[PDB]
Write a protein that binds this ligand. Structure first.
Ligand SMILES: [Mg+2]
Ligand SMILES: [Mg+2]
Ligand SMILES: [Mg+2]
Ligand SMILES: [Mg+2]
Ligand SMILES: [Mg+2]
Lengths: 79, 260, 192, 144, 96
RNA sequence: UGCAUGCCAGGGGGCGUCCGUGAUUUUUACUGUGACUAAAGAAGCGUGACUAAAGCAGUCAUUUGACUUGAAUUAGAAAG
RNA sequence: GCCAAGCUAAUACAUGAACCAACCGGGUGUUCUCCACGUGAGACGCCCAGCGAAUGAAUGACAGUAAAACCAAUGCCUUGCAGUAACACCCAGCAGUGUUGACUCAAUUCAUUCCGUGCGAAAGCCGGCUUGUU
């Protein structure tokens, strides 16, 4: 059944003494579970970092255009 | 493709003797061109003499003891070209690869907070997907959001540790440059004018500190500061000043006799 | 095999070239697709660099564009009626780029009713069932644009002439554009 | 939108440009849609290319052909091909041993767009382009 | 601090001028201006009246929309001062 | 994050940059400079590998190392 | 040089990951709430909106002259135009500005298409400690 350890039921062969037991593959441990979940967290963090980087760049572009708009308006007002 | 490099075909700046062996370390593709690079194995063995042969060079390099641009490199065929910061933490060396007045590769010793700064020449600008401006540098770096005033030919001073751009130096007349190719390689001068020839090669006319005028193609210049008195990077001892051959020979004879 | 090199060609002097190298894979050619009208049948071709071309052998559906409306629709190919290379390609129903084909006009007629509220034939789109926000939108669109007379006669008959824009032997697709303007009149004369 | 131009359409296939939709940025002086670009190297686009009816897929001003590489000068030698001309480049070659020159010439096949109409003996400026035929590697850019 | 208040969202194409005054019932509003950007500028009578108007309107639902209100730095007397300067050149423009 | 914008005024000329329109439009050879251009080989600077053909090394203190060592410069047709 | 039958792996092969999780657009409903007696406004519902590829449409600039009226719509000013990037809220500057000597190029928006001949976080491995459903 699920939620049951499988290492206990692994077939062991003895030679004449060594008990030969195969290594269990696809045994997802809590260590492996944390490793898998970290990959998804890193991926979503990366795209959010680039989205924040795009926002800052767009702010710089817009602010520079705004400053030039404010410069000539003040010059026209002082004209 | 070609995997080998004959020693006679290797660049002369590597200073490999023609009688020592048939082959030279073939530089792998990477940040710098094969003809304009200095392989890590050459640096650790022939330049620094930390390794007596290639076997000890691989032992040092494959351990990750050598850092280029704040990142360990385990490959002795790594290009490691111009204006690269090479540091060995186990010994604390921290030099930068530059050109002397002869055009040979020079290991300019760096200090703390100077090994964090690298100068990159912008060779191409393009728009990536999502309307993202990207600048390609001379060492193969792609900057995802360069300064809006950046143009091809300008140089970006870059923080290798922080992985971000700190300032921009524009390619204009009156700025200090260093020649990275041709017969004038390693000379430092100030831009006087740029002869623009569409389709052909643009010609830059420069003048050094002494006052000598020399020219080169615009692709061989590398802006390094606002003017000759203000350089953002430390240059080798000669300060990019080419000396007369007759004068240099006499000085060496006088100095040699003075020592003895 | 098939080569695209100039070694076998005569020089401009008429002299023969003495070839001193064997044929190279980098200069190969391949057999033509000769794509015909029929149910879809393609064969991938592994090309230089590991990329794949789609050598279409039979095609009877394509994505055809109405340039003036700036839209496109997937329609079935009814016939091929003109080919500039030779009428033999028309006789065999060969699909190549720039060949004149007849396509189903029903999807374009359906979109015309949805966009402008006009029934050309007067499934069957009910224009009277549209919301009053849509009928008001029909008035704005109708005033600026009038349909071309030559296009409307084709749409009533059920088939409209079009020109193939894709290369079936290279991409495996049979995309095209509806003939309009002087181009439509040019080919109408050729087809009697 | 427009009627068929008989003087231009005599090719068994409809002649048209591929950069613009002619039966709809690039509007000529006669109020027609006609693609025309500006080539670099300080060469002016001829008025016929700007305001003309001809269709040429190999013209450097109204097609996708681009000019890059060498820019040469020559004299028109033959004008018997359709849209192609032969030019001559006469030069003196130096023989070192005799310290003297000899006259030499080369012949090049050049595509000529229907905007120049050169005559035998005229002198032209040509620019390098992609191979357009077996022997054509140059396009006429100017007629002097 | 100030007598002006910023009010949004006020959808002009869907409301009349008197319709938006209903939310201003009980207050003596001198000048009220409606804008294309779905907001309204209202000049009240006293700073205390404006202040007490924004501690009970922020978040309230008006005409099917939650209202966002805040004190505005615009001043009523500056509008009258600039208007005459604009008004004289309107008549001065006729003189050219 | 308006955390921004301006603070001698003026006219008048001097320029940089890009585009448009205009000279009844001037090149080529030669020659002077400059640019670009792998080594090996050739020429050549320096250097007692015991000399030399070579090589690009080594030298000097006596040191837990100096020389911020050296390995310079040329020619290399024609065409571009 | 070779069959046939029995086992058993994967970073071989195949399959497959909703919520967490955004910004932005297009097409629509005989949907409702308001304004005017329709270049109306706003909610909600539905259909789609990733990289790359295909066809079509549009962008990829400007740079050869100085002022007035009139109509319609809409901005503001007040109850007639001074003057002002643009935008009908939730972003009051979240690109009005790619590059080249030159592009049908880079990149963006819209419509439709991709059918095996594309696109996993290899459903992978190993280390340290503090030993950790971040
Ligand atoms: Mg495993
Ligand atoms: Mg080029
Ligand atoms: Mg695999
Ligand atoms: Mg542009
Ligand atoms: Mg452009």
């Amino acid at each position: 059944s699920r939620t049951e350890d499988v290492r206990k039921y692994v077939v062991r062969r003895r030679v004449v003494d060594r008990l030969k037991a195969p290594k269990i593959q696809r045994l997802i441990t809590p260590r492996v579970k944390a490793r898998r979940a970290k990959k998804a967290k890193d991926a979503i963090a990366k795209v959010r970092a680039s989205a924040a980087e795009r926002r800052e760049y767009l702010r710089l572009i817009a602010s520079n255009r705004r400053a030039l708009r404010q410069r000539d308006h003040s010059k026209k007002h002082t004209r | 493709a070609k995997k080998h490099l004959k020693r006679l075909y290797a660049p002369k700046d590597w200073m490999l003797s023609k009688l020592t062996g048939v082959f030279a370390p073939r530089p792998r593709p990477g940040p710098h061109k094969l003809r304009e690079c200095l392989p890590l194995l050459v640096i650790i063995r022939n330049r620094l003499k930390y390794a007596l042969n290639a076997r000890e060079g691989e032992m040092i390099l494959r351990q990750g003891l050598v850092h280029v641009d704040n990142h360990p490199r385990r490959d002795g065929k790594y290009p490691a070209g111009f204006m690269d910061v090479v540091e060995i933490p186990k010994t604390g060396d921290r030099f930068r690869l530059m050109y002397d007045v002869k055009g040979r590769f020079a290991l300019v010793n760096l200090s703390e907070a100077e090994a964090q700064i690298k100068l990159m020449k912008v060779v191409n600008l393009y728009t990536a997907t999502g309307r993202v401006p990207v600048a390609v540098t001379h060492d193969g770096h792609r900057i995802r959001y360069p300064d809006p005033h950046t143009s091809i030919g300008d140089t970006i001073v870059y923080n290798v540790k922080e992985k971000k751009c700190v300032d921009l130096i524009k390619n204009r007349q009156g700025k200090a440059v260093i020649v990275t190719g041709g017969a004038n390689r390693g000379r430092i001068g100030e831009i006087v004018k740029v002869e623009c020839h569409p389709g052909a090669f643009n010609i830059a006319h420069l003048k050094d500190a002494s006052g000598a005028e020399f020219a080169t193609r615009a692709a061989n210049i590398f802006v390094i500061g606002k003017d000759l008195n203000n350089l953002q990077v430390t240059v080798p001892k000669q300060q990019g000043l080419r000396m007369n051959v007759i004068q240099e020979r006499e000085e060496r004879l006088i100095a040699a006799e003075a020592r003895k | 095999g098939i080569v695209r090199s100039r070694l076998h060609k005569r020089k401009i002097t008429g002299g023969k070239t003495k070839i001193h190298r064997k044929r190279m894979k980098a200069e190969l050619g391949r057999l033509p697709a000769n794509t015909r009208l029929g149910a879809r049948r393609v064969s991938p071709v592994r090309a230089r660099g590991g990329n794949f071309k789609i050598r279409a052998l039979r095609l009877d559906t394509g994505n055809f564009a109405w340039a003036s409306e700036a839209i496109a629709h997937r329609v079935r190919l009814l016939d091929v009626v003109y080919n500039a290379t030779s009428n033999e390609l028309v006789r065999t129903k060969t699909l190549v780029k720039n060949c004149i084909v007849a396509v189903d006009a029903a999807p374009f007629k359906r979109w015309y009713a949805k966009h402008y509220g006009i029934d050309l034939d007067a499934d069957k789109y009910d224009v009277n069932k549209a919301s009053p926000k849509l009928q008001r939108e029909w008035t704005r669109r109708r005033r600026n644009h009038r349909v071309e007379k030559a296009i409307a006669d084709q749409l009533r008959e059920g088939r409209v002439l079009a020109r193939i824009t894709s290369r079936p032997g290279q991409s495996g697709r049979a995309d095209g554009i509806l003939l309009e303007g002087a181009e439509l009149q040019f080919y109408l004369k050729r087809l009697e | 939108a427009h009627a068929v131009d008989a003087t231009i359409q005599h090719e068994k296939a409809y002649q048209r440009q591929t950069a613009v939709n002619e039966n709809m940025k690039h509007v000529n002086k006669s109020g027609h849609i006609r693609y025309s670009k500006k080539i670099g190297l300080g060469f002016k686009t001829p008025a016929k290319a700007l305001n003309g009816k001809y269709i040429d897929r190999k013209c450097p001003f109204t097609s996708n052909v681009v000019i890059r590489g060498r820019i040469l000068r020559g004299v028109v030698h033959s004008t018997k091909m359709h849209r192609t001309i032969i030019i001559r480049r006469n030069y003196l070659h130096f023989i070192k041993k005799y310290q003297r020159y000899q006259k030499r010439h080369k012949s090049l096949a050049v595509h000529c767009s229907p905007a120049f109409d050169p005559k035998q003996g005229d002198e032209v400026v040509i620019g390098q382009c992609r191979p357009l035929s077996k022997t054509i590697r140059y396009n006429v850019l100017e007629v002097v | 601090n100030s007598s002006c208040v910023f009010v949004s969202p006020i959808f002009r194409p869907s409301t009349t001028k008197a319709q938006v005054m209903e939310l201003f019932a009980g207050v003596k509003v001198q000048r009220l201006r409606m804008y294309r950007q779905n907001f309204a500028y209202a000049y009240l009578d006293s700073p205390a009246a404006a202040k007490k108007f924004v501690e009970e309107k922020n978040g309230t639902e008006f005409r099917g929309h939650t209202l966002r209100v805040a004190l505005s730095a615009r001043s009523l007397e500056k509008l009258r001062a600039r208007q005459e300067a604009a008004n004289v050149v309107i008549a001065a423009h006729r003189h050219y």
